[PDB]
Design a protein around this motif. Structure first.
Motif, PDB file in Angstrom:
ATOM      1  N   UNK A 199      35.225  46.113  50.198  1.00  0.00           N
ATOM      2  CA  UNK A 199      35.465  44.778  49.662  1.00  0.00           C
ATOM      3  C   UNK A 199      35.510  44.769  48.133  1.00  0.00           C
ATOM      4  N   UNK A 200      34.569  45.483  47.519  1.00  0.00           N
ATOM      5  CA  UNK A 200      34.472  45.707  46.088  1.00  0.00           C
ATOM      6  C   UNK A 200      35.832  46.170  45.551  1.00  0.00           C
ATOM      7  N   UNK A 201      36.370  47.287  46.043  1.00  0.00           N
ATOM      8  CA  UNK A 201      37.677  47.752  45.596  1.00  0.00           C
ATOM      9  C   UNK A 201      38.852  46.897  46.066  1.00  0.00           C
ATOM     10  N   UNK A 202      38.775  46.212  47.206  1.00  0.00           N
ATOM     11  CA  UNK A 202      39.805  45.243  47.592  1.00  0.00           C
ATOM     12  C   UNK A 202      39.909  44.152  46.528  1.00  0.00           C
ATOM     13  N   UNK A 203      38.788  43.549  46.155  1.00  0.00           N
ATOM     14  CA  UNK A 203      38.803  42.509  45.130  1.00  0.00           C
ATOM     15  C   UNK A 203      39.040  43.068  43.741  1.00  0.00           C
ATOM     16  N   UNK A 204      38.590  44.285  43.430  1.00  0.00           N
ATOM     17  CA  UNK A 204      38.987  44.938  42.189  1.00  0.00           C
ATOM     18  C   UNK A 204      40.499  45.070  42.137  1.00  0.00           C
ATOM     19  N   UNK A 205      41.142  45.573  43.189  1.00  0.00           N
ATOM     20  CA  UNK A 205      42.591  45.706  43.252  1.00  0.00           C
ATOM     21  C   UNK A 205      43.283  44.354  43.054  1.00  0.00           C
ATOM     22  N   UNK A 206      42.814  43.312  43.738  1.00  0.00           N
ATOM     23  CA  UNK A 206      43.345  41.965  43.568  1.00  0.00           C
ATOM     24  C   UNK A 206      43.255  41.528  42.103  1.00  0.00           C
ATOM     25  N   UNK A 207      42.096  41.690  41.474  1.00  0.00           N
ATOM     26  CA  UNK A 207      41.905  41.311  40.079  1.00  0.00           C
ATOM     27  C   UNK A 207      42.673  42.190  39.094  1.00  0.00           C
ATOM     28  N   UNK A 208      42.787  43.486  39.357  1.00  0.00           N
ATOM     29  CA  UNK A 208      43.594  44.428  38.586  1.00  0.00           C
ATOM     30  C   UNK A 208      45.069  44.023  38.569  1.00  0.00           C
ATOM     31  N   UNK A 209      45.557  43.303  39.589  1.00  0.00           N
ATOM     32  CA  UNK A 209      46.922  42.768  39.607  1.00  0.00           C
ATOM     33  C   UNK A 209      47.041  41.282  39.203  1.00  0.00           C
ATOM     34  N   UNK A 210      46.014  40.463  39.416  1.00  0.00           N
ATOM     35  CA  UNK A 210      45.945  39.091  38.887  1.00  0.00           C
ATOM     36  C   UNK A 210      45.831  39.082  37.358  1.00  0.00           C
ATOM     37  N   UNK A 211      44.841  39.797  36.817  1.00  0.00           N
ATOM     38  CA  UNK A 211      44.501  39.854  35.388  1.00  0.00           C
ATOM     39  C   UNK A 211      45.504  40.649  34.548  1.00  0.00           C
ATOM     40  N   UNK A 212      46.507  41.242  35.203  1.00  0.00           N
ATOM     41  CA  UNK A 212      47.549  42.079  34.608  1.00  0.00           C
ATOM     42  C   UNK A 212      48.205  41.342  33.439  1.00  0.00           C
ATOM     43  N   UNK A 213      48.746  40.160  33.715  1.00  0.00           N
ATOM     44  CA  UNK A 213      49.000  39.100  32.744  1.00  0.00           C
ATOM     45  C   UNK A 213      49.061  37.741  33.453  1.00  0.00           C
ATOM     46  N   UNK A 214      48.769  36.669  32.716  1.00  0.00           N
ATOM     47  CA  UNK A 214      48.773  35.291  33.213  1.00  0.00           C
ATOM     48  C   UNK A 214      48.674  34.332  32.036  1.00  0.00           C
ATOM     49  N   UNK A 215      49.811  33.804  31.571  1.00  0.00           N
ATOM     50  CA  UNK A 215      49.822  32.886  30.430  1.00  0.00           C
ATOM     51  C   UNK A 215      49.109  31.589  30.809  1.00  0.00           C
ATOM     52  N   UNK A 216      48.010  31.228  30.143  1.00  0.00           N
ATOM     53  CA  UNK A 216      47.310  29.991  30.446  1.00  0.00           C
ATOM     54  C   UNK A 216      48.209  28.795  30.100  1.00  0.00           C
TER      55      UNK A 216
END
Length: 90
Positions: A69-86
């Motif tokens: 789960x740790x690495x599943x959510x790390x992977x999700x965040x590693x692709x979410x946080x990649x870029x995201x203009x507020x």
């Protein structure tokens, strides 16, 4: 917080899903009462995958082990946080 919960005790099902309900009610369903068009982006781009890496209603997460789960959510965040203009404006 579920990454603590899933390892806080031997796995504790009703409560683990209550947190998935918090998550998906917040950030999984596109039919929210006051959803903004910026946040809708994130929902379309990842709500799908919450149904797949976790289950719909949390079924995979309800039994899944923390080292996964740790690495599943790390992977999700590693692709979410990649870029995201507020967003700029209400």
């Amino acid at each position: 917080d579920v990454r603590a919960e899933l390892a806080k005790t031997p796995v504790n099902k009703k409560n683990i899903e209550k947190m998935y309900e918090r998550m998906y009610a917040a950030l999984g369903d596109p039919k929210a009462p006051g959803l903004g068009a910026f946040r809708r982006k994130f929902i379309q781009t990842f709500g799908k995958e919450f149904d797949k890496h976790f289950g719909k209603g949390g079924s995979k997460l309800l039994r899944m082990k923390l080292s996964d789960f740790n690495d599943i959510t790390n992977m999700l965040l590693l692709k979410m946080n990649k870029d995201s203009k507020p967003p700029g404006n209400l």
